[PDB]
Amino acid sequence: WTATSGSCKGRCFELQEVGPPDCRCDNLCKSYSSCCHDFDELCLKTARGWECTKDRCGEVRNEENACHCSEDCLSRGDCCTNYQVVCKGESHWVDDDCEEIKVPECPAGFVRPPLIIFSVDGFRASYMKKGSKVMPNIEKLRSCGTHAPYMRPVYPTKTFPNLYTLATGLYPESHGIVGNSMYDPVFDASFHLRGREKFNHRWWGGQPLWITATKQGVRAGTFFWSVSIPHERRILTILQWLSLPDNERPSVYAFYSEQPDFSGHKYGPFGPEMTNPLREIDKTVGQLMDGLKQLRLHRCVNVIFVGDHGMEDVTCDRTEFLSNYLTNVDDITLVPGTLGRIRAKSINNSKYDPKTIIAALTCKKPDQHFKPYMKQHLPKRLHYANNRRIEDIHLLVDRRWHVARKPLDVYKKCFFQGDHGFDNKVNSMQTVFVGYGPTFKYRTKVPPFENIELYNVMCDLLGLKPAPNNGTHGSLNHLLRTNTFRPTMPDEVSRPNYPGIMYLQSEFDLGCTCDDKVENKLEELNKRLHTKGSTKERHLLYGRPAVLYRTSYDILYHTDFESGYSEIFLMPLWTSYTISKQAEVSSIPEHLTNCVRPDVRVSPGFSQNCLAYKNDKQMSYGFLFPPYLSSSPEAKYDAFLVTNMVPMYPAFKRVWAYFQRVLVKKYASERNGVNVISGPIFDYNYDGLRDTEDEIKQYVEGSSIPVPTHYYSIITSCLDFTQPADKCDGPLSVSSFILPHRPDNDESCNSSEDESKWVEELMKMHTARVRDIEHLTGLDFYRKTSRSYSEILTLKTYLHTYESE
Numbered sequence: 001w002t003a004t005s006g007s008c009k010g011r012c013f014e015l016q017e018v019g020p021p022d023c024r025c026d027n028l029c030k031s032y033s034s035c036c037h038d039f040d041e042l043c044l045k046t047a048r049g050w051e052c053t054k055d056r057c058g059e060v061r062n063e064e065n066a067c068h069c070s071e072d073c074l075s076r077g078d079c080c081t082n083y084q085v086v087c088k089g090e091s092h093w094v095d096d097d098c099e100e101i102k103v104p105e106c107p108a109g110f111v112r113p114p115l116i117i118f119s120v121d122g123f124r125a126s127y128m129k130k131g132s133k134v135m136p137n138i139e140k141l142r143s144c145g146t147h148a149p150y151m152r153p154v155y156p157t158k159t160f161p162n163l164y165t166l167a168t169g170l171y172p173e174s175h176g177i178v179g180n181s182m183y184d185p186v187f188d189a190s191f192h193l194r195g196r197e198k199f200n201h202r203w204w205g206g207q208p209l210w211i212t213a214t215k216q217g218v219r220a221g222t223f224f225w226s227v228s229i230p231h232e233r234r235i236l237t238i239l240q241w242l243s244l245p246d247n248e249r250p251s252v253y254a255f256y257s258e259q260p261d262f263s264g265h266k267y268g269p270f271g272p273e274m275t276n277p278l279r280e281i282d283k284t285v286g287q288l289m290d291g292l293k294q295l296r297l298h299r300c301v302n303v304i305f306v307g308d309h310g311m312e313d314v315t316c317d318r319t320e321f322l323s324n325y326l327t328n329v330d331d332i333t334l335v336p337g338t339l340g341r342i343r344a345k346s347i348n349n350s351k352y353d354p355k356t357i358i359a360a361l362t363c364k365k366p367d368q369h370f371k372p373y374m375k376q377h378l379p380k381r382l383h384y385a386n387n388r389r390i391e392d393i394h395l396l397v398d399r400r401w402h403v404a405r406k407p408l409d410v411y412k413k414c415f416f417q418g419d420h421g422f423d424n425k426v427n428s429m430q431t432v433f434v435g436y437g438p439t440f441k442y443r444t445k446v447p448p449f450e451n452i453e454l455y456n457v458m459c460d461l462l463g464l465k466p467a468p469n470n471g472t473h474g475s476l477n478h479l480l481r482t483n484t485f486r487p488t489m490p491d492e493v494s495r496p497n498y499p500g501i502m503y504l505q506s507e508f509d510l511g512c513t514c515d516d517k518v519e520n521k522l523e524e525l526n527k528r529l530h531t532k533g534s535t536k537e538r539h540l541l542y543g544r545p546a547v548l549y550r551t552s553y554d555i556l557y558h559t560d561f562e563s564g565y566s567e568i569f570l571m572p573l574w575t576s577y578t579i580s581k582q583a584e585v586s587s588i589p590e591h592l593t594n595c596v597r598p599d600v601r602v603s604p605g606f607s608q609n610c611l612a613y614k615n616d617k618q619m620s621y622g623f624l625f626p627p628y629l630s631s632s633p634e635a636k637y638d639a640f641l642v643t644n645m646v647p648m649y650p651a652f653k654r655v656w657a658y659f660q661r662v663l664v665k666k667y668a669s670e671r672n673g674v675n676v677i678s679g680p681i682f683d684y685n686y687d688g689l690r691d692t693e694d695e696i697k698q699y700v701e702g703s704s705i706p707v708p709t710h711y712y713s714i715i716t717s718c719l720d721f722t723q724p725a726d727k728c729d730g731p732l733s734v735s736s737f738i739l740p741h742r743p744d745n746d747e748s749c750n751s752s753e754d755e756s757k758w759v760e761e762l763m764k765m766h767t768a769r770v771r772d773i774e775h776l777t778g779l780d781f782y783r784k785t786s787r788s789y790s791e792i793l794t795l796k797t798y799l800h801t802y803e804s805e
């Protein structure tokens with residue numbers, strides 16, 4: 001209900017929105033259908049356009065005009081943005097050479113540099129280079145400020161999840177906006193782009209920037225713009241707010257544009273029609289910069305130019321239809337398009353079985369353009385499972401394709417040539433970042449980073465303490481001239497034991513046979529010294545990882561590898577080893593094939609046993625330090641210690657063996673040695689965090705040996721590959737993975753072939769950040785390097801995407 005009967009005189013674009021039924025005059029009143037009767041007349045003036053002309057210079061103010069060219073306009077803050085250019089002989093900002101902004105050059109009364117966030121929907125990363133000739137204003141921001149070559153969105157690469165991530169620093173699964181369309185089964189309510197339900201505050205979790213600001217006494221402009229407010233009026237409003245007195249003027253502002261996304265959907269990302277919306281956005285940027293220049297704020301404000309996601313070529317004809325796969329297609333509900341989410345049409349359907357659905361959708365056509373997952377089996381880098389709003393059944397859709405339920409959904413609705421929503425590592429989904437201002441660096445290019453990191457940086461720019469979020473605060477310090485955030489390494493919670501030889505061989509009854517009864521003081525003090533950690537400098541390059549939770553574990557030293565062995569999980573948390581460029585692969589000798597040896601440093605009671613694997617017909621075992629890479633046949637015995645064994649499904653063994661026997665050596669050749677840290681992950685509740693012991697859902701039959709849901713490896717080397725990994729003097733290079741520990745390879749459609757035709761493809765899909773692994777394990781890596789801690793935080797956030805440039 002609305003009493004649209006009140007007035008908007010002097011309340012135009014009000015910052016404090018009023019409550020029903022009193023009539024609103026804020027930038028969203030239209031979208032709620034609640035504007036006072038006189039809103040259009042007073043707040044959406046258009047008379048005489050958006051530009052001064054020589055005829056208007058020194059006009060008599062007339063309050064009907066959209067903007068002003070009267071002598072008084074600057075003190076009132078409502079000049080047309082081009083007023084000084086036309087009337088006072090100034091240049092457009094874009095025509096001025098850039099000059100380093102060493103300090104904020106702000107009017108007296110400004111307590112901090114204001115922040116303006118200029119967000120462009122669907123602005124694909126490659127537009128910065130491909131459109132540079134038609135976007136001079138943006139081009140000057142980019143070249144003179146700090147820029148990345150791209151910024152990685154979150155999954156799914158849609159509008160509301162990304163905008164809300166930019167606002168909060170949270171993954172979708174945590175902030176709650178997991179799609180542009182959602183069903184919440186707890187509320188029994190639906191969220192859609194279109195309609196009113198999306199305005200209900202129960203959808204929107206975490207704490208977005210404007211709330212963070214307000215709670216710490218920093219005043220915010222309204223972030224949201226009804227689609228009917230023209231861009232020029234959004235810019236003028238922001239400029240007018242910037243002219244307010246000290247106690248009223250906001251410190252943080254946002255401009256949002258629906259372009260180039262609107263046009264990209266109709267014409268495709270590089271359609272010839274796209275040039276004009278890129279020109280129009282650049283013009284809007286030039287109005288903002290000219291406007292700031294006339295207010296003498298162009299060297300005072302920090303400007304962020306950012307997008308939500310990119311845009312791919314997608315047409316009607318590249319639709320997969322589930323009615324080609326499923327006999328029961330009317331018993332499901334599908335959220336369709338560039339991703340798929342499936343649930344039962346009716347929860348009273350006891351015949352609905354997700355396993356048979358998944359099975360019917362798996363590797364059925366030879367170039368099938370989607371892949372079905374249970375949500376817990378999606379790549380852990382997507383962080384796309386821990387929310388009741390995400391359906392159990394997910395379809396990851398190939399770039400350039402759609403998925404739909406039946407043909408009638410896609411022709412009773414080709415219109416469009418563009419779409420987005422794909423996997424967030426897909427190059428077409430990448431978007432933009434530029435920072436320009438006194439707190440940003442000058443003419444600096446920074447590596448690509450994830451949009452989950454920006455909220456912290458926006459908080460640093462405003463002097464705010466960020467709410468808890470998924471950013472890694474300090475990982476983006478290299479973008480900032482000042483206001484950097486300098487954290488301390490987390491404190492180690494559990495200190496390790498360093499056990500010696502405490503158990504006789506006959507105390508063990510492992511059902512584990514080993515033919516190792518195969519016999520000198522030269523070599524005996526040398527093997528003793530390896531057990532006490534004499535090669536640890538070699539295999540533990542960056543220090544031991546710290547354990548950030550309360551537990552019982554032991555450090556175990558060996559010739560070729562070092563491990564942190566959990567007495568609670570009966571296996572290593574981590575195993576660390578260095579393979580040089582020269583290392584030789586050998587094979588497992590036949591006198592050791594099914595050998596597992598007791599580790600006389602670790603109790604039988606805190607050891608695994610072979611009998612449990614023998615009895616478990618589904619489960620087998622592998623090794624964390626690969627016996628294939630042992631340095632000598634004497635050191636090879638260490639690799640068969642029971643304390644280096646981990647539970648593995650035979651299907652996963654094919655992956656792991658190929659990684660260890662073929663890929664590690666290959667990476668050592670390419671990178672000039674590698675350091676490898678490998679271990680188990682337990683995330684049975686798919687929350688992205690280390691499981692406690694009581695969350696573990698599966699054990700090796702008849703034992704207390706828990707089964708990992710994933711295995712990780714972190715592969716580190718020298719960024720300058722002319723130095724070996726063990727004598728690196730400068731920055732590091734890293735690639736990692738979190739491989740799903742699955743009992744089949746249904747994921748890999750070509751898995752009946754040789755491992756050289758499918759394993760690497762699987763590993764690429766499950767590439768990970770170190771930081772992902774840290775959350776999943778409760779470990780902290782890279783504790784002892786030469787490098788600054790912020791540089792190490794940048795490293796830990798790196799994702800190796802395997803996409804071309």
Ligand SMILES: *[C@@H]1O[C@H](CO)[C@@H](O[C@@H]2O[C@H](CO)[C@@H](O[C@@H]3O[C@H](CO[C@H]4O[C@H](CO)[C@@H](O)[C@H](O[C@H]5O[C@H](CO)[C@@H](O)[C@H](O)[C@@H]5O[C@H]5O[C@H](CO)[C@@H](O)[C@H](O)[C@@H]5O)[C@@H]4O)[C@@H](O)[C@H](O[C@H]4O[C@H](CO)[C@@H](O)[C@H](O)[C@@H]4O[C@H]4O[C@H](CO)[C@@H](O)[C@H](O)[C@@H]4O)[C@@H]3O)[C@H](O)[C@H]2NC(C)=O)[C@H](O)[C@H]1NC(C)=O
Pocket residue numbers: 170171173174175176202203204205206383386387388468469470687688689775
């Ligand atoms: C990414 O960054 C974020 C932010 O840092 C990380 O998420 C945090 O994860 C924490 C651990 O999972 C979690 O802490 C829990 O908080 C519970 C109280 O939470 C409410 O209050 C906070 C603060 O205002 C608020 O943030 C929460 O918001 C969530 O829920 C609302 C719904 O109201 C959503 O709108 C919002 O989107 C958000 O949803 C997300 O998180 C929840 C979990 O909180 C998920 O369920 C959703 O899917 C979604 O992901 C809340 O409004 C508190 O109950 C927890 O405590 C339980 O467990 C501890 C063990 O330490 C125990 O001591 C407690 O007693 C309690 O146990 C009891 O409850 C159990 C469960 O019901 C029960 O089984 C037991 O028997 C006990 O009786 C816990 O402290 C924190 O909430 C979130 N924050 C956010 C914003 O998500 C995230 O982990 C990072 N991701 C990665 C990969 O690093």
Ligand SMILES: O=C(c1cc(OCC2CCOCC2)nc(C2CC2)c1)N1Cc2ccc(C(=O)N3CCc4onc(O)c4C3)cc2C1
Pocket residue numbers: 117119121122159160163164166167193209223224225226227254256258261262306
């Ligand atoms: O003003 C905002 C806005 C802005 C916003 O900004 C959050 C900021 C962003 C920068 O960093 C700080 C947080 N957030 C939010 C909310 C998360 C809090 C909203 N709008 C208006 C508007 C109008 C229409 C639509 C829309 O339906 N489409 C256009 C884009 C698109 O692409 N494909 C498609 O189909 C569509 C269809 C979306 C918005 C977002």
Ligand SMILES: [Ca+2]
Pocket residue numbers: 121122158159160261308309
């Ligand atoms: Ca968008």
Ligand SMILES: [Ca+2]
Pocket residue numbers: 682683684685686687688689690691
């Ligand atoms: Ca977990």
Ligand SMILES: [Cl-]
Pocket residue numbers: 156158178179180181335
């Ligand atoms: Cl969606």
Ligand SMILES: [K+]
Pocket residue numbers: 612613614615616617618619620
């Ligand atoms: K077995």
Ligand code: NA
Pocket residue numbers: 745746747748749750751752
């Ligand atoms: Na397969």
Ligand SMILES: [Zn+2]
Pocket residue numbers: 122159261262265420
């Ligand atoms: Zn779109």
